[PDB]
Amino acid sequence: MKAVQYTEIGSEPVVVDIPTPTPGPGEILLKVTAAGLCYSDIHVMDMPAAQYAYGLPLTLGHEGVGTVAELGEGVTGFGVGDAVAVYGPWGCGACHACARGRENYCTRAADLGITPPGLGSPGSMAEYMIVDSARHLVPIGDLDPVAAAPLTDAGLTPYHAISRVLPLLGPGSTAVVIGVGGLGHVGIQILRAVSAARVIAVDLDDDRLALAREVGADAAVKSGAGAADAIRELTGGQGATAVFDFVGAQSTIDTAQQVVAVDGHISVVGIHAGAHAKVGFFMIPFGASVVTPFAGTRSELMEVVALARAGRLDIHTETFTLDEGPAAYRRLREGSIRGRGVVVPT
Amino acid sequence: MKAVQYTEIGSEPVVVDIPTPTPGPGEILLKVTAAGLCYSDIHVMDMPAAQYAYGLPLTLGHEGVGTVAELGEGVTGFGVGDAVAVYGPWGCGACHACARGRENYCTRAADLGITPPGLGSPGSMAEYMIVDSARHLVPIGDLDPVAAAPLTDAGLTPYHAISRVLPLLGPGSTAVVIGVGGLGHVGIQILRAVSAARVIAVDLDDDRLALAREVGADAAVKSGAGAADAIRELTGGQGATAVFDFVGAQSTIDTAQQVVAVDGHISVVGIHAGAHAKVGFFMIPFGASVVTPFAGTRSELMEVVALARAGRLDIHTETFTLDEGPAAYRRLREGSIRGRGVVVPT
Amino acid sequence: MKAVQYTEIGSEPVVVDIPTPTPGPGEILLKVTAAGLCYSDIHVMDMPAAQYAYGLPLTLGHEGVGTVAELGEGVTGFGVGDAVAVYGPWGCGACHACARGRENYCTRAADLGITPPGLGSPGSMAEYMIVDSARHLVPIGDLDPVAAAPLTDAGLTPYHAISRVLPLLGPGSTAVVIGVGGLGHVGIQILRAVSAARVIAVDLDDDRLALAREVGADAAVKSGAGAADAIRELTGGQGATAVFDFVGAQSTIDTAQQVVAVDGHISVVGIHAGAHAKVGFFMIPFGASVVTPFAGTRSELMEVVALARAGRLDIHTETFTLDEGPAAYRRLREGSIRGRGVVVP
Amino acid sequence: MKAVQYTEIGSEPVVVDIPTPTPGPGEILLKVTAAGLCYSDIHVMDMPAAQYAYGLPLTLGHEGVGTVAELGEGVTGFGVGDAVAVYGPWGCGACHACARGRENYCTRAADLGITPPGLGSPGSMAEYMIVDSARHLVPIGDLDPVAAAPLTDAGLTPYHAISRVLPLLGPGSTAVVIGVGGLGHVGIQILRAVSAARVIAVDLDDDRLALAREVGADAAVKSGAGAADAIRELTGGQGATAVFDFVGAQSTIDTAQQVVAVDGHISVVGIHAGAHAKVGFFMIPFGASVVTPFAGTRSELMEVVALARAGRLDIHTETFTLDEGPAAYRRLREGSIRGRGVVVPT
Ligand SMILES: NC(=O)c1ccc[n+]([C@@H]2O[C@H](COP(=O)([O-])OP(=O)(O)OC[C@H]3O[C@@H](n4cnc5c(N)ncnc54)[C@H](O)[C@@H]3O)[C@@H](O)[C@H]2O)c1
Ligand SMILES: NC(=O)c1ccc[n+]([C@@H]2O[C@H](COP(=O)([O-])OP(=O)(O)OC[C@H]3O[C@@H](n4cnc5c(N)ncnc54)[C@H](O)[C@@H]3O)[C@@H](O)[C@H]2O)c1
Ligand SMILES: NC(=O)c1ccc[n+]([C@@H]2O[C@H](COP(=O)([O-])OP(=O)(O)OC[C@H]3O[C@@H](n4cnc5c(N)ncnc54)[C@H](O)[C@@H]3O)[C@@H](O)[C@H]2O)c1
Ligand SMILES: NC(=O)c1ccc[n+]([C@@H]2O[C@H](COP(=O)([O-])OP(=O)(O)OC[C@H]3O[C@@H](n4cnc5c(N)ncnc54)[C@H](O)[C@@H]3O)[C@@H](O)[C@H]2O)c1
Ligand SMILES: [K+]
Ligand SMILES: [K+]
Ligand SMILES: [Zn+2]
Ligand SMILES: [Zn+2]
Ligand SMILES: [Zn+2]
Ligand SMILES: [Zn+2]
Ligand SMILES: [Zn+2]
Ligand SMILES: [Zn+2]
Ligand SMILES: [Zn+2]
Ligand SMILES: [Zn+2]
């Protein structure tokens, strides 16, 4: 089969031909219908050799949707042809966190050699992919695969981040979304669907601010030195109940600390190495909590899919072939994909 | 009446004679039965002239218990002689936070000129004190006033901090308490009363570690460079579900970050100017939230009092006269009060 | 001033002339801009003499909005002219429930002689009204008073009921609303604003089903013997995550028990004497909780007002003068007010 | 092997000899170390032929602990010899409830033919037993199996019931426990470990009231016509925050409704056919919720085991051999087991 792989440190990923895998016991083989590109893949490919630990070659793609092609020995609960989304952050399944479906916060996975697809195990940017266990598949019915693939991370991650503090976001609350890309543009729509928060979007790029308004942001503010004052102006001096920072640069985290309300929340979701919130007296308001959330839970993925099926998430995508995979990653690096890049194998 | 006041910047507080106040409409005059000394009073007295904003002179004492002496015009809900604790963090009473009793997180108080007793308004270290409103008194019944006075901050503040994350502290959880002084020694006992968490206490002083074990800590370990490794040894490498840092120095916050579990919590309660947690990817575990909580809520103070009345809180105190007030503050500076210093007026 | 009062047991309320009150210390006098009619007023007026305990005469109206006219001695936090809504379920202000703003669940109010406006103390169906304390006023800014008055109960009560189980109502959930009247039509809109629940409305009247669809219900079905099967058909046999019964008759509670999901909720909000859910093994699904909620909290009223100010609540009203007050109550009895009746002085 | 089976409708269970089973793929064979008797087994054996639906013969025992004897094909996560408790309420593992570990509330199990051990599938009252999947085992380490077996239902069920409303049970709260038998005597101890509630126990039998005090009840009241007034006397007229009714007869549910506080809770846990709470205006206080909970969740079972391992649960048992199984069930019927009956195979 055709796949897109990261094959040597510092180089662009390449289109390859590798064997179509066969499922062992408990496993499922999917025919991939859509594979999302996430900016996390760029963080991974930019790691120096000393930091990089996922093995070479590596089939990319941690956002995967497909149809069941072959059942491994013992597998029931899915039929051949079933449309499924892949739950990404694989855990041990047995610990206290995993028993609640919170496999994103499993502490045993590393020691057991469990790695996620596209980030240690073979990903979804290929004609076919293996899934380790039935509990890591979620049915999607007749959902369009292209709009469905991003739900598995661009949807799941903001959904989880928002869910951690959803009781704060009552009528009268304000939520700030910093970064209107793959994650951010879905985050705005989740906020609108599950809360009565007023949503203020923040981005460097005017066209992303337009995207923000298109998907339901109440206001849009230019990022940078003026953002904090502009946000406070909109919130009448009380600040924002919650800030969801999908950039996570030091400048955006600083903006978040300068606008968050007393007894509010900052969720540092975007990854920028070295950047951090400074949580201490006189540097942040009383009662304003800060966290770096990771991925999401099994039941949260089901909820994201339910939002999509109810028509609550308009996922903005651009489609690419497998051959266009390396080019699509260049587009993501330069910031020219309006929403989520998705590879459709054929 | 006799009172202890901070009268000039940089100097020790002094015993003074000032008029016994009379309550205006809505106010209550208390005969003070006990007034706690909090290390926050030392932070206040160590502020340079440029930072200090509470006015001079200032009657100290933000931990107050008394008996109702005189009702101001229009006051109902209390009779002369009723034993009451003073709710410290006065708010506007009208905003969304105050409507839930969360006057500790009121955003309107500053602009309305509302200041707390002992920290802008006259405190409890005097024979008598004014309380602005009936809603800032809580009945204590026959509770010993000396052990009751610390409940209003040494009790309330750890109670609130713990309450923010109480659902995390189920059976199998571990809570670390850093700093076994006024706040910390009460915090250990709250954890034992309201959760099934295993409690690990941390302090510089071996006698405070003994205090920790006396009030129910399951383990007590020496603070400093070795503390993080010793705590991890006790938690089997998973780390601590929650860390309540009642010191809040950079070294203790660093210890907290090095031991906190995935999806855990650090509560930075102690105040050490410039110290802060660094909340960013690779600097803290995924899902570990951090906050600087402040004081507590009206209903939380009632719950603290209920714990005391049920025999769940053994409050360690040393008693001082009003004349010994300045000496008691020197004792607090040097770290020689085993628990909470309390002034009893006579 | 002119007021509408219940004056003798069994009779219709009457328009009267009574003195304009003056505020004592701590009190506020409002010029009333809008006063809602609630079907609870009909329950009260239909009480026999033995049951009725609110005193005669009684100025009706537990849904009140006004402008501050006079401050009593010592009152701060409001200026003359401020537009305010009245928080209805007055409590002692001092107990553990009241300290959290949950004065709707205060246990001390009765013994202290605290009664709510329109239900023991003088209500809002008058040119002016007294409010006991500043904490029982909530600012409404430039909100239209006519659409604002129902927020104080038609809004507050469903808001509280929904709020008790809001964490159940995630994406993929279903909420059933039984009774699309004053309360129900606002409840549909609250569900849409604060949850991703799919909303199924139930009513006897086809025009109320149309109202339900107008304010955002995803489906609207006829009440009665066929309702339970029709709801199950819509939910694919799993049933409804939550049922908010704003009728509360035995037949509607039975429908609720026949459709509620495992680990779901029934909120019995409407009042029908003797009617009750039967909560026991084999009579209801495992984990399905049932409650009769009452009114709402201080912070909940603020949230309802915030929803109204954000344009999330389209409150359907019909306006009446004080003189038309008795006629408006006849209209409410016969079921001919499409939404909430409101009296404007 | 030797087993205790229900073999014909209306008759006592009998000791039998049946083949030692072999595990299919995904299954685990346990050597049973302890098997609890639950009063639910008596409800089942008292069902008329028309109602009874679990098949004949049926190996009894839905409270099971053992050691792993043989792994079925593909099973990982356990070694031969590991001491484990059996999670009883088996679900499909795939639905939204099961994804959160809430297999007790799975809606798909019936249609998929999934039945629990001792209640449709073969139970633990035998030398060996099959478990369907690894996710239905929980490690117990060196816990005494005899005291561990009741944790799987006598522990789990009260734990879940209490957990549903744990945020109500703050300092100052009161919890009533009706019925101090297998479940009730563990329920008292859970309340003491995870809350600061004052605990009032209610039973018909004075010796069970003594048991209640032995395991930490603050007060003990005789059940019957006087119970409601005696409970109100103890709660000062406000009533009980929560009532956990482990009898569930109409008389005990009536007592519960007559004592529950405004904004409180009644949990109807015990099963008595036809008995029900009457939830309507003027028949129950405002805001007092009522529910019939069922069993518990995967993570809750882990928490119960963690309580046992921390020394928080003193489980009162009487031990029986397999041959004494039928006699033990007669003892349970007549109410002469002081706590939980447990069968130890040899
Ligand atoms: N925590 C997790 O579990 C998790 C999961 C997935 C992705 N991520 C991270 O989320 C981040 C975003 O990923 P994506 O796929 O949405 O990226 P993207 O490239 O699709 O979107 C980036 C967006 O951020 C905007 N942006 C960049 N700098 C900005 C600034 N200073 N101020 C305001 N806006 C700015 C861009 O204009 C663009 O709109 C990445 O760092 C990614 O690694 C985290
Ligand atoms: N956040 C709030 O609302 C709030 C409220 C009250 C007090 N506080 C703050 O809490 C802190 C504690 O106040 P207190 O009155 O309990 O003080 P205290 O002097 O009574 O107790 C201090 C304790 O901390 C220990 N300690 C000091 N340095 C340490 C270190 N590096 N490692 C371990 N232990 C150490 C001491 O040995 C002593 O036992 C103060 O900074 C105070 O201002 C905060
Ligand atoms: N719990 C509380 O705190 C509280 C507060 C306020 C009002 N209430 C009660 O809520 C109930 C509704 O109040 P309202 O002011 O909205 O009444 P309303 O007269 O405005 O509306 C009643 C609606 O119910 C519908 N209806 C009547 N019987 C029905 C049935 N069997 N099935 C389906 N629909 C039916 C009508 O067609 C109408 O649309 C009343 O019983 C009132 O006393 C309770
Ligand atoms: N909801 C569930 O998931 C679930 C799970 C397990 C058991 N159960 C049920 O819980 C109940 C208790 O089970 P168990 O095994 O502890 O029973 P058990 O026979 O060990 O204990 C019964 C206890 O209740 C007491 N009692 C009986 N009638 C009483 C009354 N009127 N007032 C006060 N006390 C009374 C007895 O004196 C005894 O102490 C049974 O009905 C059982 O079927 C329910
Ligand atoms: K919404
Ligand atoms: K405890
Ligand atoms: Zn990603
Ligand atoms: Zn795990
Ligand atoms: Zn202090
Ligand atoms: Zn305030
Ligand atoms: Zn009403
Ligand atoms: Zn009250
Ligand atoms: Zn059982
Ligand atoms: Zn299931």
The beta-carbon neighbor of C196 closest among A193, A198, A302 is A193
Q: Name residue C87's amino acid.
A: Y
Scored b (16 or more CB within 10 A) or e, C261-283 reads bbbbbbbbbbbbeebbbbbbbee
Return the SS3 of B17: strand
Query: Measured between beta carbons, which residues in chain D are less than 8 angstroms from residue B193?
Result: 171, 196
On whether the CB atoms of residues D65 and D145 are closer than 8 A, the answer is yes
* Residue D33 CA to ligand 9 centre (angstroms): 55
Q: Which ligand is nearest to the CA of A196?
A: 5
Q: Residue holding tokens 């199984």?
A: D325
Cβ–Cβ < 8 Å for A74, D74:
yes
Chain B partners within 8 Å of D302 (Cβ): 172
Return residues with CB closer than 5 A to ligand 11 (ion).
Answer: C 38, 40, 153
Paired tokens of B344: 């009893």
Distance from CA of C26 to the nearest CA of B (A): 7
Q: Which tokens in the block code for residue A317?
A: 């995508």
SS3 of residue D139 by DSSP:
strand
Answer yes or no: do C298 and B100 touch at CB < 8 A.
yes
Q: Enumerate neighbours of A (3 or more CB pairs within 8 A).
A: B, C, D
Which ligand neighbours the alpha carbon of C194 most closely? 5
The experimental technique behind this entry is: X-ray
Q: Report phi then psi at C276, rounded to 5.
A: -160, 150
> Which of B238, B283, B294 minimises the CB distance to A287?
B294
D43 lines ligand 4 (CB under 6 A): yes
Report the distance separating Cα A103 and Cα A94, nearest Å: 9
Task: Report the C-alpha gap between A268 and A292 in whole angstroms.
Answer: 5
**D100–A302 C-beta distance less than 8 A:** no
Q: Is any atom of ligand 2 closer than 6 Å to the C-beta of B159?
A: no
Determine the atom of ligand 2 nearest the C-alpha atom of B37: 15
Cis peptide before C171 (omega within 30 of 0): no
Chain A positions in Cβ-Cβ contact with residue D25 (cut-off 8 Å): 25, 73-74
DSSP line for C201-223? EEES-HHHHHHHHHTT-SEEEE-
Rounded Cα distance between D193 and A274, Å, is 42
How many Å apart are CA B300 and CA B307, to the nearest integer? 11
Give the tokens for residue D12.
């006592």
Helix (H/G/I), strand (E/B), else coil: D320: strand
| D327-334 contact pairs (CB < 8 A, 24+) | D328/D37, D329/D12, D329/D13, D329/D37, D329/D41, D329/D42, D329/D45, D330/D12, D332/D37, D332/D39, D332/D41, D332/D42, D333/D42
Tokens 């009774």 sit on residue: C179
Q: Rounded to the nearest whole angstrom, what is the distance from the C-alpha of residue B96 to the centroid of ligand 10? A: 7
Q: Return the ligand 4 atom nearest residue D249 CA.
A: 31
Contacts of A83 (CB under 8 A, 6+ apart): A33, A65, A66, A67, A139, A140, A141, A142, A143, A145
Which residue in the set D171, D304, D312 is minimally distant from B310, CB to CB?
Answer: D171
What is the rounded distance in angstroms from the CA atom of residue C220 to the CA atom of residue A108? Answer: 49
Name the residue in chain A with its Cα closest to that of B161. A287
Do B106 and B96 meet the contact criterion of CB atoms below 8 Å apart?
A: no
Proportion of chain C in helix, strand, coil states, percent, rounded to 5: 30, 25, 45
Give residues with Cβ within 8 angstroms of B151, minimum separation 6: B85, B186, B301, B304, B305, B308, B313, B315
| D277 within 8 A of D248, measured Cβ to Cβ | no
Backbone angles phi, psi at B237, to 5 degrees: 85, -5
Rounded distance, CA A98 to CA A299, Å? 11
Q: Exposed, middle or buried by CB within 10 Å (0-12, 13-18, 19+), for B290?
A: buried
Contact assessment for residue A270 and residue A179, using Cβ atoms and an 8 Å cutoff: yes
Under a CB-based contact definition with an 8 Å cutoff, are residues D230 and D203 in contact?
no
Distance of CA D294 to CAs C288, D62, D159, D178, Å? Answer: 10, 14, 11, 17
Nearest to C269 by CA among C178, C195, C193, C332: C178
Query: Is there an atom of ligand 2 within 6 Å of B205 CB?
Result: yes
Q: In one letter, which amino acid is B279?
A: V
Residue D219 CA to ligand 13 centre (angstroms): 27
Is residue C273 within 8 A of residue C253, CB to CB? The reply is: no
Within chain C, residue ranges assigned H as helices are 39-45, 96-99, 145-148, 156-163, 182-194, 206-214, 227-234, 250-259, 298-309, 325-334
Cβ contact D34:D12 at 8 Å: no
What single-letter DSSP state applies at residue B117?
A: B
- Options 3.10.180.10, 3.30.70.3270, 3.90.180.10, 1.10.10.10; which CATH number does C1-157+295-345 get? 3.90.180.10
Cβ–ligand 3 contact at C38 (below 6 Å) = yes
Instruction: Kindly tell me the sign of the dihedral angle through the C-alpha atoms of C44, C49, C51, C52.
Output: positive
Cβ partners under 8 Å of residue B60, min gap 6:
B4, B5, B6, B13, B41, B118, B123, B125, B325
CB contact under 8 A, D172 and B302: yes
Contact at CB, C96 and B302, closer than 8 angstroms? yes
- Pocket of ligand 3, candidates C177, C188, C271, C340: which has the most ligand atoms within 8 Å of its Cβ, to mutate? C271
Helix axes B156-163, B182-194, angle to 10 degrees: 50
User: Which residue in chain C has the smallest CA separation from B100?
Assistant: C100
The vertex-C207 CA angle with C203 and C208, nearest 5°, equals 40
> Other CB atoms closer than 10 Å to residue B42's CB: what's the count?
12
- Indicate yes or no: CB of C196 within 8 angstroms of CB of A302: no
Quick one: which of A70, A207, A179 has its CA closest to A131?
Answer: A70
Asked if A71 contacts A18 with a C-beta cutoff of 8 angstroms, the reply is: no
Do A310 and C171 count as a contact with CB atoms less than 8 A apart?
Answer: yes
Maximum CA extent, chain B: 61
Question: What is the crossing angle of helices D227-234 and D250-259, to 10°?
Answer: 30
Task: Say if residues C83 and C103 touch (Cβ distance below 8 Å).
Answer: no
Q: Determine contact, residues B94/C135, Cβ cutoff 8 Å.
A: yes
* Domain assignments of chain C as residue spans, ordered by start: 1-157+295-345, 158-294
- Residue C2, CA distances (Å) to B59, C128, C330 in order: 53, 9, 20
Phi and psi (nearest 5°) for A269? -100, -45
For residue B62, report the distance from its CA to the centre of ligand 9, in Å. Answer: 6
Nearest Cα of chain D lies from the Cα of B303 at a distance, in angstroms, of: 5
Biggest CA–CA distance in chain C, Å, is 61
How far apart CA A5 and CA A119 sit, in angstroms, is 11
Residue B126 DSSP class? B
Phi first, then psi, for residue A151 (nearest 5°) are -55, -30
Chains with ≥3 CB–CB distances under 8 Å to B: A, C, D
CB C104 within 8 A of CB C294: yes
Contact A287 B277 (CB under 8 A): no
Q: Is D226 in the pocket of ligand 4 (CB under 6 A)?
A: no
Q: How far is B107 from chain A (nearest CA, A)?
A: 7
Of D74, D135, D299, the CB nearest to A100: D299
Query: Residue C334 CB: number of other CB atoms within 10 A?
Result: 8
Q: Convert chain A into a string of H (helix), E (strand) and C (coil).
A: CEEEEECCCCCCCEEEECCCCCCCCCCEEEEEEEEECCHHHHHHHCCCCCCCCCCCCEECCCEEEEEEEEECCCCCCCCCCCEEEECCCCCCCCCHHHHCCCHHHCCCCCCCCCCCECCCECCCCECEEEECCHHHEEECCCCCHHHHHHHHCCCHHHHHHHHCCHHHCCCCCEEEEECCCHHHHHHHHHHHHHCCCEEEEEECCHHHHHHHHHCCCCEEEECCCCHHHHHHHHCCCCCEEEEEECCCCHHHHHHHHHHEEEEEEEEECCCCCCCCEEECCCCCCCCCEEECCCCCCHHHHHHHHHHHHCCCCCCCEEEECCCCHHHHHHHHHHCCCCCEEEECCC
If 0-12 CB within 10 Å is exposed, 13-18 middle and 19+ buried, where does residue A54 land? Answer: middle
| Residue B201, beta-bridge partner list | B177, B220
* CA C137 vs CA B134, C64, C79: distances in Å: 18, 10, 12
| Helices and strands of chain B, counted as H and E runs | 10, 17
Query: B-D interface: how many C-beta pairs under 8 angstroms?
Result: 46
Listed in sequence order, the residues at least 6 apart from C1 whose beta carbon sits closer than 8 Å to its beta carbon are C17, C18, C19, C20, C126, C127, C128
Among candidate residues B134, B159, D198, B74, the one with its CA nearest the CA of residue C95: B134
User: At a CB cut-off of 8 Å and minimum separation 6, what does B7 contact?
Assistant: B13, B14, B16, B56, B57
Distance B222 CA to ligand 2 centre (A): 15
Which is nearest to A56 in space by CA: A105, A100, A122? Answer: A122
Amino acid present at B89: P
CB pairs under 8 A between C and D: 108
Phi, psi for C107 (deg, rounded to 5): -95, -10
* Reported CATH class of domain D158-294: alpha beta
Q: Coil, strand or helix: which one is D338? A: coil
Strand-pair category, D174-178 with D240-245: parallel
> Residue A88 CA to chain centroid, in angstroms?
10
Cα separation, A252 vs A262, in Å, equals 18
Q: Which residues face D289 on adjacent strands?
A: D265
Q: Both ends of chain C: CA-CA distance in Å?
A: 10
User: Which tokens sit at D222?
Assistant: 């005789």
Cα(D254)–Cα(B235) distance, integer angstroms:
46
Cβ–Cβ under 8 Å, residues C46 and C6: no
Dihedral angle computed from the Cα positions of residues D72, D13, D57 and D11, in that order, rounded to the nearest 10 degrees? -170
Secondary structure of residue D254 in the 3-state scheme: helix
List the beta strands (DSSP E) in B144-270: 174-178, 198-203, 219-222, 240-245, 260-268
Q: Do C273 and D262 touch (CB under 8 A)?
A: no
* Cβ neighbours, 10 Å, residue A222: 14
Residues with C-beta atoms within 5 A of ion ligand 12: C 91-92, 95, 98, 106, 108
List Cα–Cα distances, B340 to B288, B315, B343, in angstroms: 31, 8, 10
Task: State the burial class of residue D300 (Cβ atoms within 10 Å of its Cβ: 0-12, 13-18, 19+).
Answer: buried
Written as one string, the DSSP assignment of D26-67 is T-EEEEEEEEE--HHHHHHHTS-TTT--S-SSEE--SEEEEE
Both tokens of D188, joined, read 């008292």
- The CATH class given to the A1-157+295-346 domain equals alpha beta
Peptide bond into A57 cis (omega under 30): yes
Closest of A236, B296, A194 to residue C309, by C-alpha: A236
> What are D83's two structure tokens?
């001491």
User: Taking the mean position of all CA atoms in its chain, how far away is CA A69?
Assistant: 26
Which one-letter amino acid corresponds to residue C117? P
Q: Please tell me the distance in Å from B26's CA to the nearest CA on chain C.
A: 8
